[PDB]
């Protein structure tokens, strides 16, 4: 299973808003993974698992068309 990260935010409201926006551009599960990093809480907006590289590429394209960020492959944390 393949995963994308679309953004990482200190503001949880920004992360939740991006998660909601992404649900309108992809059918893959969208979730927030929040971690302690550099003495702060970081809210990572992620999606997956995606079943194939081709679907990852098309999902990246749809996120860029929606101007929602520069999505990068991440391995699940
Ligand atoms: C190889 O290392 C990895 O590189 C990744 C490169 O993509 C990196 O991920 C990125 O991390 C940056 C921070 O380091 C993160 O940047 C946030 O960027 C957004 C813009 O997209 C900021 O949001 C905007 O802020 C302005 C004002 O500053 C607002 O006016 C505007 O409305 C905001 N936009 C939205 C949509 O709300 C955001 O700042 C806001 C203020 C916030 O924190 O709430 C930036 N956050 C921070 C904390 O600086 C960027 O989104 C992220 N990109 C992706 C695709 O995830 C990896 O780092 C992240 C943190 C991670 O590790 O998960 C690098 N990994 C490591 C281990 O170093």
Author numbering: 266 to 342
From the primary publication:
However, it is known that the sporulation-related repeat (SPOR) domains (Pfam 05036), ubiquitous in prokaryotes, play a central role in directing proteins to the septum by recognition of the unique septal PG (rather than recognition by other division proteins), which is enriched in denuded glycans, the PG devoid of peptide stems. Of all SPOR-domain-containing proteins, RlpA is the most highly conserved across bacterial species, which underscores its important physiological role in bacteria. It is predicted to have two domains, a catalytic “double-ψ β-barrel” domain (DPBB; Pfam 03330) and a C-terminal SPOR domain. In the present report, we disclose the X-ray structure of the SPOR domain of rare lipoprotein A (RlpA) from P. aeruginosa (SPOR-RlpA).
In order to characterize how the SPOR-RlpA domain interacts with denuded PG, we solved the X-ray structure of the complex with compound 1. Co-crystallization and soaking were both performed in parallel and resulted in two structures for the SPOR-RlpA:1 complex at near-atomic resolution (1.30 and 1.48 Å, respectively). The two structures are identical (rmsd of 0.16 Å for the 77 Cα atoms); the description provided herein is for the 1.30 Å resolution cocrystallization complex. The opposite face (convex face) of the SPOR domain does not present any of the features observed for compound 1 interaction, thus pointing to a single PG-binding site per SPOR domain, consistent with the mass spectrometric data. The high-resolution data for the SPOR-RlpA:1 complex allowed us to map all the amino acids and water molecules involved in glycan-chain recognition. (ii) Notwithstanding that all four saccharides interact with the protein, interactions are not evenly distributed among the four subsites. (v) Main-chain interactions are essential in PG stabilization by SPOR domains. (vi) hydrophobic interactions are observed with F274 and L307. In agreement with our mass-spectrometric experiments that clearly noted the absence of binding of compound 5 to the SPOR domain, the crystal structure of SPOR-RlpA:1 reveals that recognition of the carboxylate moieties of muramic acids at positions 1 and 3 is crucial.
